[PDB]
Amino acid sequence: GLEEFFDDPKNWGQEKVKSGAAWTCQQLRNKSNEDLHKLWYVLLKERNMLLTLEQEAKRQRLPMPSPERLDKVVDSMDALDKVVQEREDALRLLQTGQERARPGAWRRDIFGRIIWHKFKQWVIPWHLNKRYNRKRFFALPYVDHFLRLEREKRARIKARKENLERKKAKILLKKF
Amino acid sequence: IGIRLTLPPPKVVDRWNEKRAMFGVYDNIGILGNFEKHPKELIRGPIWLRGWKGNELQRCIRKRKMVGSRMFADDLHNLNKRIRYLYKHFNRHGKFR
Amino acid sequence: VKKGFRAAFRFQKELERQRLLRCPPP
Amino acid sequence: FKTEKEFMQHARKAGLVIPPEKSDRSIHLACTAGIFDAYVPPASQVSIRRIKDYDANFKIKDFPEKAKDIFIEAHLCLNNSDHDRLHTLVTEHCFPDMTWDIKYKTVRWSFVESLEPSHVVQVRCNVYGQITVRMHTRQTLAIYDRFGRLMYGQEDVPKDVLEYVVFEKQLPYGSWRMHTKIVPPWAPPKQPILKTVMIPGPQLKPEEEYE
Amino acid sequence: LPPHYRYGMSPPGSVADKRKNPPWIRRRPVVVEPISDEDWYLFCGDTVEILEGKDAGKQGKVVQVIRQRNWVVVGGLNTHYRYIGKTMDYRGTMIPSEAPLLHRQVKLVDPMDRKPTEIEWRFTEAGERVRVSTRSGRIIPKPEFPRADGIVPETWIDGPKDTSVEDALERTYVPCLKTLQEEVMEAMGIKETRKYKKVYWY
Amino acid sequence: XXXXXXXXXXXXXXXXXXXXXXXXXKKXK
Amino acid sequence: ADRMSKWTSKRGPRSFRGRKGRGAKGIGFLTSGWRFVQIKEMVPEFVVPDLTGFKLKPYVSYLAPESEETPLTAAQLFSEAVAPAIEKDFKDNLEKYGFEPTQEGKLFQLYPRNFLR
Amino acid sequence: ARGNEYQPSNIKRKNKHGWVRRLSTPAGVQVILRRMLKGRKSLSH
Amino acid sequence: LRNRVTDRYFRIQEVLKHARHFRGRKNRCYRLAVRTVIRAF
Amino acid sequence: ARNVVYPLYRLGGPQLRVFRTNFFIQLVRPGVAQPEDTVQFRIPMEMTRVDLRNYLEGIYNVPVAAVRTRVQHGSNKRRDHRNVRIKKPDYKVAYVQLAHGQTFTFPDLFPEKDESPEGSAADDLYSMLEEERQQRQSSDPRRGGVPSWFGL
RNA sequence: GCUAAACCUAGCCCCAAACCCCCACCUUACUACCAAACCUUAGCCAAACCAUUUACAUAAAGUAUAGGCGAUA
RNA sequence: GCUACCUAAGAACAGCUAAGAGCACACCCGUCUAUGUAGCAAAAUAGUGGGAAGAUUUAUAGGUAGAGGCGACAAACCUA
RNA sequence: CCUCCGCAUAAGCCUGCGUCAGCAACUGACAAUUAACAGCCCAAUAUCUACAAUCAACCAACAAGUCAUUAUUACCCUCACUGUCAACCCAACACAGGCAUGCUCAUAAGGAAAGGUUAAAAAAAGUAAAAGGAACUCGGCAAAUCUUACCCC
Ligand SMILES: [Mg+2]
Ligand SMILES: [Mg+2]
Ligand SMILES: [Mg+2]
Ligand SMILES: [Mg+2]
Ligand SMILES: [Mg+2]
Ligand SMILES: [Mg+2]
Ligand SMILES: [Mg+2]
Ligand SMILES: [Mg+2]
Ligand SMILES: [Mg+2]
Ligand SMILES: [Mg+2]
Ligand SMILES: [Mg+2]
Ligand SMILES: [Mg+2]
Ligand SMILES: [Mg+2]
Ligand SMILES: [Mg+2]
Ligand SMILES: [Mg+2]
Ligand SMILES: [Mg+2]
Ligand SMILES: [Mg+2]
């Protein structure tokens, strides 16, 4: 029903709601996968309740009753999304040994810089993929000037920052 | 009216700093160390002008021939332009011939 | 901020003279 | 505006939400806002024993010879405007009551000797002790202007004045400082001022009539 | 908060701090001395003794510590006076506000001496790192600050949306090689007879 | 019982343009 | 002429605003006469569980203890799930103990990810 | 008479200076590489 | 700029002090006051 | 779910299923007059209206009968001190029509004034600031600037 | 006495040493999903025009040589 | 994205007399005059005009690019 | 009292006179335009398609024209997504400029030429004029009236 988008009627207009702690990640590894699945939708409905109230707070020109418990629901939702990933990323190491969930290759686009190419799903193989074959993954010889100029820009940026650190660190032995 | 309304923070200066107290040591390392070293093997600076003095056209021509292979690309192009300018200035322009 | 002491020292002593042409002592 | 409340309403109209932010640190106070029980001048023995546990050495029968000396040496801090010394001799609730109106004018208060030896009337009670002491002294007072023409009182003639002087101590480094000064309602009215005053009439708009 | 931000007393998200540090101020940074994390020895709650300035020699207690400027604000002491509450026709009431003190301007105080000392993080078999004074070989504790948030830990009764401790510890986990997608789909009770067809990835 | 209020700010910008010279007179002479 | 703004579905002519949409994933296909055939299996159905009798409220009470964070690895998972069955079947073909060697026959493939989230 | 030489169109702006046309020739890939070396916020239309 | 001129207020004031009793802008602005102080001298 | 890569559908394969939904939601108050059945939500951009129909029949057990969406252009015309624009974000708006002739109105969250009156004695601090509103000791006009501290 | 003035530290320069780096995106870039690169630089300028020509560790050495045997190399 | 020309597929042209026809609108152009001349405007305004079913005008997209393009040659026009 | 404007679409622009607050449309907060209109289309392989349009019927053309399938094979799901605001765009401007189409072709729609005064000169825009009628001037330019005839190219 639609009353789950708001808290109890004994909590409308209180400016302090006594809430517990956010779940930390250690408590959630001890729960099972059917028992974290249901904790997601309890945390999903408590998040959706707070997101209406934060919108009705801004609409009524009023401060929130307690915005610190939306910090406690986001930091406990991601803690649940961390423990699902920690079993998905470990079960793939035992079954297939791959460290990433999506396939991909290190390629080098037209501008010569090395990029990670995350793969996409297709129904036809790549040599008859008309759009894919236009996207070209190599650098021609005219790029090597700009690769040397980009390299010297980061070498100037790093030689500026490392030199500025020592210039601040000898000032420390002048005041102290 | 660019003159300061307060007098500037004081200049303390450490005359018996380690750099100042030992300034000059081993400047005479050749003439009383059996000439195993020259005093110009004490000078520490850019690799192209150690023990060598010249004007700006002699300096950029020497910096290019010694360190131009590993100079940065937009910094090298300024050097070739500068040599091409100081060639034209020192060889074509001036009051005296 | 142009560096140096001597102009700031002259100008400090020439503002004291202006302090005595506006506020002279008894 | 006029109140702290109207700002919370003109924010809610304009839509400026100011949320309450928590701080671990609060404001550390060392007096009170007012008198505890305003002794009404014309049975407090536990409170004297509520002083001796936080003080460990407290004799009342030597006290208003000391409490008189806070009084007249906080008042000489008015003649010279030593705002440093008045904070050690008078409390933070009393300090704006005796320095705000005397700003930019020269006071010439002076203490000529008393008429009766001053004594206590009532004593009461983180924890604040309060000793309401009656002084019946003769003081000389001349207030001046910024320009230093006389604005209040003669500078020579001593007048006799009755004072109810409440004191206060914060019960580790605290001392007794004057807390307030209870003027009684049966007291005579003070010296009439030098200048003459017009008290202005009701300002009528064009649609109001004066009755 | 921008780089070279200027910390002060009001914390950096506040109403008073936004006025003092708007996102266009570019003032000269203060130069602090770099104290590491293990070299800081004054906490919220220590009874410390001022040296320099007003309240000379007087011992107070630290109520806040702004570590980003090596700053200790001693409770009730090193005070000035200011007013609070504005309407346009008001006179004033003082509150004794505190000014901060550098960490070279305060010293720790022994429980059995009430006297100033220094601190060297001595190593004991009873504790992995703890304050031991330099004049006496005594373990000085780290005192109890009230709580980081509002907690009041031991006196806490839970509302209807808090798990009990019996349920937030209940290890129902069975370590097994099944996906949460696979574990739920046997428990949610679905059948999926259709088999996935191979797509490519490039 | 005397204090501060709410906050305030500022706003500023500037730009220019370019032209030519044309449609004069007083020919060959 | 305005380039720093984002190029979005509101911003072209009529034929530019039809193609570019938001990030909203496709649900079926288009056919002759611009008729959209919504495919039932491209639409994601939420498998929502039943939360009655469920004793896990969204917060934690503050009487709980603190532990330390030891994350789950491929060694901790193996030492719990597959290692003890080995010691019960070594002291007496890895597909018995839990190896799935190739997975083109699974519904929920772990590489590449078949399943949502 | 003059001044309104710009008559905006999005099918013309994208077909002339778009990212696809800037990559369609090697003369214009060095346009894009000159924009990232300057550090531009926007390398094409 | 390695070394710039800090004494320039005192060089203006050697010429402006001789022009203080003049009329108009030749007592204040140095560029006009230096041509009249020279002509007065 | 949003910011995840969906599996591909080919003809005769299985059913696509989210288990742990990514997109959360908020129900807002109608700022214009709507009928008594029309509920208004704030969808995120990556959600369709077939997705919103299943979100409320599934997670909340709501008889939804019609959904109508529109994308609201958040404003990009407000600048800083650097004269850089600040983008207020786009958001998608739902319009759920409740089946069976159900009726929903938005509740009065934050009912305007609740207990008796505004405030007093908040901390010890507010009673330190309220009892000088009782004890300002305003001036008498028959005094004219003379301080009322001295008993003379 | 208005407008203003003052400021000192953000940062930079030069060297040494060291070889530095979830999702979407070539279609209308930032859009989940369908049958091919290599190829002499010229010119200003100098020769008082210009037309061959004109530079792009130390020492031997501005030497041998080259050159409208000239500017110069 | 102006303009010179072209390509694809579009659009517009009242009323009256009777065909690169006449009168005449919308529309296209810019003859003469006055105002304007840091202007409303880096070429405008008011009136007066030329054409207005044609070698017409026009919206949309594409093309040709500087040792060039394009040109009913004005050495015009190719982003004031 | 004006109305040669207006209302829609297209293109362009991208929250740009809605609520609350702060010569004599800007800033902060909140809110909004909802698909039926309009975009976003098409399973293969062969083979199909001489006869404009114009009220299409007579009559007339030349410049020769915008409008179509069939055969066998394959096919069962279905209403998703995206635009929808404004006093708006291009001209550096809240610019006497420019700007496609459908309807209204004088309005049912849209607007205000005068901040207040005084009533000089010069200047701009207009209306009236005795008697004369091109004497003006380079020229009937302009205005006012409607016309003859003869050239050059
Ligand atoms: Mg055009
Ligand atoms: Mg829609
Ligand atoms: Mg020459
Ligand atoms: Mg005709
Ligand atoms: Mg002409
Ligand atoms: Mg005609
Ligand atoms: Mg000709
Ligand atoms: Mg000619
Ligand atoms: Mg203009
Ligand atoms: Mg009207
Ligand atoms: Mg008007
Ligand atoms: Mg006027
Ligand atoms: Mg006149
Ligand atoms: Mg006449
Ligand atoms: Mg004549
Ligand atoms: Mg004549
Ligand atoms: Mg005429």
Q: Among C2, E44, H13, which Cα is nearest to I8's?
A: C2
Judge contact between D164 and D134, C-beta under 8 A: yes
Residue entry with tokens 């320099």: E52
Q: Do residues B51 and B42 lie in contact, with contact meaning Cβ atoms separated by under 8 Å?
A: no
* Protein-covered nucleotides on strand L (Cβ within 7 A): 1-2, 37, 41-44, 60-63, 79-80
Looking up tokens 């409390």, which residue turns up? Answer: D91
- Return the ∠ at Cα J130 (arms to J124 and J132), rounded to 5°: 115
- Is E114 contained in some domain? yes
Query: Distances in Å between the alpha carbon of A16 and those of A19, A62, A68, B30, G57?
Result: 9, 14, 10, 84, 19
Instruction: Report which of G59, G50, G69 is spatially closest to residue E165, judged by C-alpha positions.
Output: G59
* Distance separating alpha carbons of residues A100 and D63, to the nearest angstrom: 83
Amino acid at site I31: R
Any chain I CB within 8 A of the CB of C11? yes
What pairs with residue E61 in β-bridges? Answer: E47
* Whether G30 contacts G18, CB under 8 Å: no
Report CB contact under 8 Å: E31, A172: yes
Is J75's Cβ below 8 Å from some Cβ in G? no
Instruction: Indicate the burial class of E47 (C-beta count within 10 angstroms; 0-12, 13-18, 19 or more).
Output: middle
User: Ligand 3 centroid vs A75 CA: distance in angstroms?
Assistant: 78
What is the F27 CA–ligand 8 centroid distance (Å)? Answer: 18
Q: Which domains does chain D have, with CATH numbers?
A: 4-182 (3.10.450.240)
Q: Residue A94: helix, strand or coil by DSSP?
A: helix
**Facing J146 at nearest CB: one of D33, D140, D143:** D143
Helical residues (DSSP H) of J66-143, grouped into ranges: 126-130
Q: Which residue has the tokens 């998040």?
A: A47
B9 to chain C: closest CA residue: C5
Asked if B7 lies within 8 A of C12 by C-beta distance, the reply is: yes
Residue G95 half-sphere exposure, CB side, CA atoms within 13 Å? 5
CA atoms within 13 A on the CB side of D161: 24
Helices I8-16 and C6-22, packing angle to 10 deg: 40
Tell me the C-alpha distance between A173 and E67, whole Å.
Answer: 20
D149's tokens: 């023409």
Q: Which domain holds residue J19?
A: 1-152
Identify the contact set of chain H against chain A, taking CB-CB distances under 8 A.
23, 26, 29-30, 32-34, 36-37
CA–CA min distance C12, chain B (Å): 7
Angstrom distance, E31 CA to M148 C1': 105
CA pair distance D100, D105, nearest whole angstrom: 10
A22 Cα: distance to centroid of ligand 15 (angstroms): 109
Residue J59's alpha-carbon distances to A5, A43, G46, G47, in angstroms, are: 11, 12, 8, 9
CB B81 within 8 A of CB B60: no
**Which is it for the CA torsion D176, D178, D182, D187, positive or negative?**
positive
Neighbours of D137 (CB within 10 A): 20
Residue-wise DSSP of G17-54:
HHH---SPPP-EEE-GGG-EEE-TTTSPEE-PPP-TT-
CA angle A77, A78, A81 (to 5 degrees): 95
Query: What structural domains does chain H harbor?
Result: 3-45 (1.10.287.3980)
Quote the CA–CA distance of J78 and J71 in Å, as a whole number.
20
Flag whether E180 is in a domain.
no
Note whether J25 and J55 are within 8 A (CB).
Answer: yes
Nearest CA to J6 out of A41, G112, E191 is that of G112
Which structural technique was applied? cryo-EM
The first and second tokens of residue A135, run together, are 């996207």
Three-state SS string over A26-48 comes to HHHHCCCHHHHHHHHHHHHHHHH
Q: Residue A143 is which amino acid? A: V
> Alpha helix (H) ranges present in H1-45?
10-17, 19-22, 26-38
Domain count, chain J: 1
Q: Which two tokens stand for residue H22?
A: 């800037």
Helix (H) or strand (E) run with residue A69 in it: helix A68-95
Round to whole Å and give the CA distance between D96 and J137: 12
Task: Name the minimum distance, in Å, from the CA of E178 to any CA of chain A.
Answer: 8
> Diameter of chain B by CA atoms?
61
> Which CA-bearing residue is nearest the C1' of L43?
H1
Fill in the DSSP letter of residue H16. Answer: H
The answer to whether residue F15 neighbours chain E at the CB level (below 8 Å) is: no
Number of domains chain E contains: 1
Per the structure block, which two tokens stand in for D35? 């008198």
Query: Which residues have C-beta within 8 Å of that of residue E201, sequence separation ≥ 6?
Result: A103, A119, A120, A121, A122, G112
Alpha carbon of residue E6 to chain centroid:
18
Closest in A62, A64, A67 to D12, CB measured: A62
Residue E169 and residue A30 in contact, taking contact as beta carbons nearer than 8 Å: yes
The G 26-55 residues near strand M by Cβ under 7 Å are: 26-28, 30-40
Chains A and C touch (3+ CB pairs under 8 A): no
Strands A114-118 and E162-163: unpaired
Which helix (H) or strand (E) is D163 found in, with range? strand D159-170
Of J82, J86, J91, J103, give the one whose Cα is nearest residue J35.
Answer: J103
Q: For residue A118, give the H/E element and its range.
A: strand A114-118
How far lies J60's CA from each of A54, I35, J1, J53, in Å?
20, 92, 17, 11
User: Do residues J78 and J125 lie in contact, with contact meaning Cβ atoms separated by under 8 Å?
Assistant: no
Residue from D193, D104, D113 nearest J152 by CA: D193
- In the reported structure, the alpha carbon of residue H7 is separated from the centroid of ligand 1 by a whole-number distance in angstroms of 7
SS3 H25: coil
Nucleotide M17 C1' to residue D150 CA (A): 61
Round to whole Å and give the CA distance between J77 and G91: 74
Q: What is the DSSP letter of E128?
A: S
Contact J134, D33 (CB under 8 A): no
DSSP code string of D80-121: TT-TTTHHHHB-TTTGGGTTSTTTTS-B--EEE--SS--EEE
Instruction: Mark the nucleotides of strand M covered by protein, meaning any atom under 7 Å from a CB.
Output: 10-16, 20-22, 26-35, 38-43, 77-85, 89-92, 97-98
Distance of CA D10 to the CA centre of its chain: 34
- CA angle, residues J95, J101, J106, in degrees to nearest 5: 50
Residue D83 tokens read as: 């705002």
Distance G13 CA to M104 C1' (A): 28
Instruction: Compute the distance between CA of residue D95 and CA of residue D129 in angstroms, rounded to an integer.
Output: 18
* The two structure tokens encoding residue J132: 């000088």
What residues have CB less than 8 Å from D140, skipping those under 6 apart? D108, D109, D110, D111, D112, D155, D156, D157, D158, D159, J152
What whole-number distance in Å separates Cα of residue G42 and Cα of residue G26?
Answer: 8
Q: Is the CB of A5 under 7 A from strand K?
A: no
Pairing of strands J70-72, J64-67: unpaired
Residue pair D143/J146 in contact (Cβ under 8 Å)? The answer is yes
Q: Who touches strand L, with Cβ under 7 Å?
A: F 17-20, 22-23; H 1-3, 5-9, 11-13, 15-17, 45
Q: Which residue, chain included where needed, has tokens 């060959």?
A: F28
Nearest nucleotide by C1' position to the F22 CA atom: L42
Contact call for F1 and J83, based on CB within 8 A: no
Alpha-carbon span G97 to G86, nearest angstrom: 7
Cβ-contact H25, H18 below 8 angstroms? no
In three-state secondary structure terms, D204 is: coil
Measured between alpha carbons, how far is D87 from D58 in angstroms, rounded to an integer? 23
CA-to-CA distance for A47 and A59, rounded, in angstroms? Answer: 18
Judge whether residue H15 contacts strand K, using its CB and a 7 Å cut-off: yes
Chains that touch J (3 or more CB pairs under 8 A): A, D, E, F, G
Cα E144 to Cα E113: distance, rounded to the nearest angstrom: 20
Cβ neighbours of residue G6 closer than 8 Å, sequence gap 6 or more? J87
Residues from chain D contacting residue J152 (CB–CB below 8 Å):
139-141, 153, 159, 161, 190-191
Chain centroid to Cα E163, Å, comes to 26
Q: Can you read off the two tokens belonging to residue H41?
A: 């916020």
Range of the domain at E74: 1-144
* Interval between CA E68 and ligand 10 midpoint (Å): 68
Does residue E102 lie within any of the structural domains? yes
Residues with Cβ within 8 Å of residue G98, at least 6 apart in sequence? E177, G81, G82, G85
Token duo for residue J113:
């004034």
Q: Considering only alpha carbons, which residue of chain A is nearest residue J110?
A: A13
CA distance B82 to B76: 10
Distance CA I19, CA I32 (A): 10
| Residue among H37, I38, G85 nearest A147 (CA) | H37
Residue B74 and residue A148: Cβ atoms within 8 Å?
Answer: no
Cβ pair J4:G4 closer than 8 A: no
**Burial readout E167-201 (b: 16 or more C-beta within 10 A, e: otherwise):** bbebeebebbbbbbbbbbbebeeeeeeeebeebeb
Interface probe with E: pick from A6, A25, A34, most Cβ of E within 10 Å: A34
Say how far apart CA D204 and CA D202 lie, in whole Å: 6
Looking across all nucleic acid strands, the nucleotide with the smallest C1' to CA distance from residue H43 is K29
Contact between A50 and A69 under an 8 Å Cβ cutoff? The reply is yes
Gap from J128 CA to M152 C1', Å? 112
Whose C1' is closest to the CA of J67: which nucleotide? M34
| Phi, psi dihedrals of residue E119, rounded to the nearest 5° | -135, 130
Distance, CA of E136 to CA of E202 (rounded, Å) = 71
- Here the CATH number for the domain that contains residue J101 is 3.30.70.330
Long-range contacts of E49-56 (CB under 8 A, 24+ apart): E49/E106, E49/E107, E49/E108, E49/E109, E49/E116, E50/E74, E50/E77, E50/E78, E50/E101, E50/E105, E50/E106, E51/E105, E51/E106, E51/E107, E52/E101, E52/E105, E53/E78, E53/E105, E54/E78, E54/E79, E55/D173, E55/E79
Distance (Å, whole) CA B46 – CA B71: 13
Pair of tokens at residue G68: 């330390």
Alpha-carbon gap: E17 to the closest alpha carbon of chain A (Å): 19
Q: What does residue D180 show for φ and ψ, rounded to 5 degrees?
A: -155, -165
Determine if strand M comes within 7 Å of the CB of A52: no
How many Å apart are CA J17 and CA E181, to the nearest integer?
9
Q: How far is CA D153 from the centre of its chain?
A: 21
Cα B39 versus chain centre, distance:
16
Contact of E109 with E51, CB cutoff 8 Å: no
What residue has its CA nearest to the C1' of L37?
F23
Residue at the smallest CA–C1' distance to nucleotide K12: A160
Place of tokens 């702690």: A21
Give the DSSP H or E segment for D178. strand D177-181
* Rounded distance between C-alpha atoms, residue E59 and residue E77, angstroms: 8
CA distance J142 to G102: 101
In the structure encoding, which two tokens stand for residue D175, read together? Answer: 């001392």
As a whole number of angstroms, the distance between CA G74 and CA A89 comes to 8
| CA E199 centroid distance within chain | 53
Rg (CA), chain E: 27
Specify the pairing of strand G59-60 against strand E162-163.
parallel
Name the J residues in 120-149 with CB < 8 Å from any F CB.
129, 132, 136
Q: Is E14 exposed, middle or buried (0-12, 13-18, 19+ CB in 10 A)?
A: middle
Query: In whole angstroms, what is the distance from residue J138 CA to residue B42 CA?
Result: 83
Instruction: Evaluate if the CB of J15 falls below 7 Å from strand K.
Output: no
Whether E199 sits inside 8 A of J8 (CB atoms) is: yes
A83, B34, C2, I6, I16 from B11: Cα distances, Å: 61, 42, 15, 17, 33
**Total residues belonging to chain F:** 29
| CB J8, CB J23: distance < 8 Å | no
**Burial of residue A65, with CB atoms counted within 10 A of its CB: 0-12 exposed, 13-18 middle, 19 or more buried:** buried
Nearest to E62 by CA among E79, E81, E82, E76: E76
Cα(H2) to ligand 8 centroid in Å equals 26
Cα separation, A2 vs J105, whole angstroms: 10
Cross-strand pairs, H25: none
Contacts of E65 (CB under 8 A, 6+ apart): E42, E43, E44, E71, E72, E73
D132 in helix, strand or coil? strand
Half-sphere exposure of J38 (CA within 13 A, CB side): 13
Residue with tokens 């010691």: G87
**Best mutation target, A144, A150, A151, A152, to test chain B (most B CBs within 10 A):** A152
Question: What is the SS3 assignment for G90?
Answer: helix
Whether residue J28 contacts residue A59, with contact meaning beta carbons closer than 8 Å, is answered with yes
User: CA of J104: which chain A residue's CA is closest?
Assistant: A2
Is the CA virtual torsion A29, A35, A36, A40 positive or negative? Answer: negative
C3 close contact with B: CB closer than 8 A: yes
C-beta of residue B71 within 8 angstroms of C-beta of residue B79: yes
Tell me how many helices (H) and strands (E) chain B has: 3, 0
- Omega before residue D200 within 30° of 0, cis: no
Q: In the block, which residue shows the tokens 């004594």?
A: D119
Give the chain D residue whose CA is nearest to the CA of E151: D24
